[PDB]
Amino acid sequence: ERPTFYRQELNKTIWEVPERYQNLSPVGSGAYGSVCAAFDTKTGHRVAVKKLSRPFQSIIHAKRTYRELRLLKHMKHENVIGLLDVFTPARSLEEFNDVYLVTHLMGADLNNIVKCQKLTDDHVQFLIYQILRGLKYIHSADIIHRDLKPSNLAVNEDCELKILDFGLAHTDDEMTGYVATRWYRAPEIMLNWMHYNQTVDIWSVGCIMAELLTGRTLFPGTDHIDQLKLILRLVGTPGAELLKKISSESARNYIQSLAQMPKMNFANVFIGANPLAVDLLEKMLVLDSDKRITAAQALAHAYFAQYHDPDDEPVADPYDQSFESRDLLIDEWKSLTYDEVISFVPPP
Ligand SMILES: Nc1ccc(Nc2ccccc2)cc1
Ligand SMILES: [Cl-]
Ligand SMILES: [Cl-]
Ligand SMILES: [Cl-]
Ligand SMILES: [Cl-]
Ligand SMILES: [Mg+2]
Q1: For the purposes of burial, counting CB atoms within 10 Å of the CB of 110, is it exposed (0-12), middle (13-18) or buried (19 or more)?
Q2: Measured from the CB, is residue 255 less than 6 Å from ligand 1?
Q3: What is the CATH number of the domain that holds 278?
C-alpha cells in the first residue's frame, strides 16, 4: 500500500514526500541534488532526504542514478552509510521522474575533529581501525571507494565512524590547484597513469592517518606536479623493480627526467608517534601499489591489538556489477531504476 504524500516548496524547490517525514529544513545542494534534514516518525531517527537533480537527463546521468541506488541498497555494515528508504511520488513507470534517497543524518566529519580536538594515540587507533573494518567489507564486494578523505568520514560524540560519499565517477577543474579533493589520491591515478584498483583506497587511509597524528595535511600540493614531487620526496623515486612494471609511456618519460631520491626515515618525519603507527604507515604509503598492505592484513597489525576481533570483522554478500559494461537507452536505465525503487525492503 502506497503512503500518502504531501507537497511543499523549500528554497524554490518542490518536495513531495510521505507523511512520515516531518519538519523538513534545507541543509545544502550540490550538483547532484538538494538535501533537507527531517524527522522520521516511523523510526524516530533524524534523517537526511536527498532529491536527485535531473536524474535521467542523459544516458550518462541515468546510468549514474542506477549506479548510486544499486550501491546504497547493497551496503549493510556498521562502518558504512546505509539506505533507510528510497521513494518516488510517481504511481507508474510512465509518470516516473523524481527519485528521493533517505539516510541517517550525519553531524561532524573527521575534518572537524582534526582541526578542533586533541587526539590521543588511542583515538587514532580506534578511528583508523573503523575505517579499515569498513574497507575490508567494501573491498570484499569488489567495490573501490575512490574518494576517501576526511570530509567523507562521519564521526559522532562516541568516536564512532561511518564511510560516506562513494565515488560515482569529479571533473578536471575540481581537481586543479591547491585543493583537498586531490590531496588524498594515490600517485598512479593522479594523472591516470594506471587503471583504478582497490589499493588506491589504502593510499588514502595512509594520508588520513598521517594527518590525525600530526594535525597537518601530508601532501598539500599546489597542483598535480607539485604534489607528485612532495610524494616522491617522502617515499622515494621508482626503483628498478617498479620501473619494469610501469605500462604508461607518459609516466615513464616524465619520471625519467627527475633526479633520483631515496625513501626518507619515517621516524624522523612523524616525531613522537607510536613506533607501531610508524610501521603501519610505512606499509600503506608504498609507491608500488602491488606491495601495499591490504585492509584485511592491516586489521591484524599489532597497532590495533586492543580492538581487533577476527570474529567481528564481517565481509559482504557478492555484488553483481555486470551492468557497468552494458549499453542501454535512457528509458532502459530508467526502468531498471524504477524496479529497484519499488523492490526496496527497509532494514529492521
Ligand atoms: N603502469 C604504472 C605502474 C605504476 C605507476 N606508478 C607511478 C609511476 C610514476 C610515479 C609514481 C607512481 C604508474 C603506472
Ligand atoms: Cl507516511
Ligand atoms: Cl516522479
Ligand atoms: Cl576533506
Ligand atoms: Cl548483486
Ligand atoms: Mg563528500
Answers
A1: buried
A2: yes
A3: 1.10.510.10
Residue 287 Cβ contacting ligand 1 at under 6 Å: yes
Answer yes or no: is the C-beta of 201 below 6 A from any ligand 1 atom.
no
Q: How far is the CA of 88 from the centre of ligand 1 (A)?
A: 45
Name the active-site residue from 165, 226, 279, 288.
165
Reported resolution, Å? 1.5
How much distance in Å is there from the Cα of 295 to the middle of ligand 1?
21
Q: Is the CB of 109 under 6 A from ligand 1?
A: no
165 tagged catalytic: yes
Which residue numbers belong to the known binding site for ATP? 27-35, 50
What range does the domain containing 207 cover?
110-304
Q: Which approach determined this entry?
A: X-ray
